Design a protein around this ligand. Structure first.
Ligand code: B12
Length: 409
């Protein structure tokens, strides 16, 4: 149809699936990723028996931790617990296996996620002035999740998502939050969930595609390379032709195909967001999913690029702190930013804290300064160009400088 990408080189898709393959074995609570599972099921690729065991661990961990305690066993956080944002994605994972939340534990989880959105609605406080504690992205994903499990939220919850769509938004992220918000609305619209806002919701969806389609860079991308998959995902639901989508969507293909054969898609989460798209599938396909639709097996990557020894110098610097820190760390070539961070800690006076996430290690504290409220520890490559990847996916080159900067958004 109108916003459609033709199929790609069968082995390029297979290449991406092979990146996911080593994750199907890290069933650790701090490595289980519902987005990966959803990724596979909606792709043209299929792991194998590993899948079912992965889903089982998801069901185990996510329920064992989010439900199962009365007066608490006198501990701080004895699992860490999945975030409510993470719970939302787990719900899509269930859908990926053609399942609805079953039993009391189902009722409990649904109830929990409805509460999260309710707190995030208080956090905003009416239709002006105030941010969610998480982000409008998880807010949109919360609404979408429950909508896929045939659970409705009150109009006052949808209201806040409706409002964020109009203005707001600066810097690449906008395009993802728009796409997510956009998808949520599609869902609601396709089942008439908030009738009192039916006409209102349709307008918003129309608002979203303008915002997104407007943000198409001359390369062909939507916002950036990593905002493109989720953008396309949303745009593959909009049924209004003319011409607009046709060429713009087909342009994105070129921009994507280029980046793809460049190795831009290293991150497991990002592969799992593109794979459905690559298979003409969206998260909206999780309303009526096809569990019998066949997918080709994935052989183990088996061979692993051995690379080559070449010791390189990378300058790590932290301004935005007490005495500014800067030290030329020496690592093996192909090392990740996290390796540079790691060597610095053991080398001298440097520390850092991370958190796990569906996206990988998230940098939270540097040199003993934990990021506050609407601030975060930005990653940058000198001069002043923010990184498109995290500490665990960016592999700096010789003589490069990395800045860890505490900005506020
Ligand atoms: C929310 C968000 C943020 C927020 C998070 C704070 C908040 N609001 O609570 C802010 C604005 C701070 C942010 C910053 C960054 N982000 Co961000 N972010 C997102 C967004 C919109 C949604 C993620 C989300 O909420 N997921 C839902 C829940 C279920 O997932 P989760 O794993 O539990 O969510 C946590 C992590 O995703 C983490 N997080 C957010 N961004 C990133 C990026 C990386 C690399 C990692 C490891 C973690 C991480 O924030 C969430 C917890 O609050 C996505 C869009 C997308 N398409 O995924 C981009 C996205 C994940 N971010 C991205 C990037 C590049 C970054 C930064 C590295 C930017 C930078 N140059 O410094 C930083 C991370 C800083 C760090 N210390 O590592 C990319 C990752 C691309 C890739 N190939 O890995 C994405 C896809 C956006 C994009 N299109 O470029 N981000």
């Amino acid at each position: 149809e109108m916003c459609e990408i033709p199929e790609m080189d069968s082995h390029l898709v297979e290449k991406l699936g092979q990146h996911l393959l080593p994750w199907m074995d890290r069933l650790s609570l701090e490595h289980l990723n519902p987005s990966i599972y959803v990724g596979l099921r909606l792709s043209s690729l299929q792991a194998g028996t590993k899948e079912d065991l992965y889903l089982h661990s998801l069901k185990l961990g996510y329920q064992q931790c989010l439900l199962g305690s009365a007066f608490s066993e006198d501990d701080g956080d004895c699992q860490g617990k999945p975030s409510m944002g993470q719970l939302a994605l787990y719900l899509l994972a269930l859908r990926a296996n053609c399942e609805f939340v079953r039993g009391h534990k189902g009722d409990r989880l649904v109830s929990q996620l409805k509460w999260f959105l309710e707190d995030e609605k208080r956090a905003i406080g009416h239709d002006h002035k105030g941010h969610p504690h998480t982000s409008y992205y998880q807010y949109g994903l919360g609404i979408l999740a429950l909508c896929l499990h045939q659970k409705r939220v009150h109009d006052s919850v949808v209201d806040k998502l409706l409002y964020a769509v109009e203005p707001f938004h600066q810097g690449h992220h906008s395009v993802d939050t728009a796409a997510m918000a956009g998808l949520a609305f599609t869902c609601l619209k396709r089942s008439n969930f908030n009738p009192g806002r039916r006409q209102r919701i349709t307008m918003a969806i129309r608002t979203v595609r303008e915002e997104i389609l407007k943000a198409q860079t001359p390369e062909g991308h939507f916002g950036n390379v990593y905002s493109t998959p989720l953008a396309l995902q949303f745009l593959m639901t909009s049924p209004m032709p003319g011409a607009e989508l046709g060429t713009a969507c087909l342009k994105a293909r070129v921009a994507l195909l280029a980046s793809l054969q460049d190795g831009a898609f290293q991150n497991a989460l990002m592969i799992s967001q593109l794979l459905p798209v690559l298979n003409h599938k969206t998260y909206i396909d999780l309303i009526f999913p096809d569990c019998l639709a066949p997918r080709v097996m994935l052989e183990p990557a088996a061979e692993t690029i051995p690379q080559t020894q070449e010791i390189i110098s990378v300058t790590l610097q932290v301004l935005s702190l007490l005495p500014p820190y800067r030290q030329s760390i020496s690592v093996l070539a192909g090392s990740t930013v996290e390796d540079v961070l790691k060597k610095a800690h053991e080398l001298g006076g440097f520390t850092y804290e991370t958190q796990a996430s569906l996206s990988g290690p998230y940098l939270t504290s540097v040199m003993g300064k934990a990021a506050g409220e609407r601030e975060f520890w930005q990653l940058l490559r000198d001069p002043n160009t923010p990184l498109l990847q995290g500490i665990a996916d960016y592999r700096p080159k010789d003589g490069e400088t990395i800045e860890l900067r505490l900005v506020s958004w």
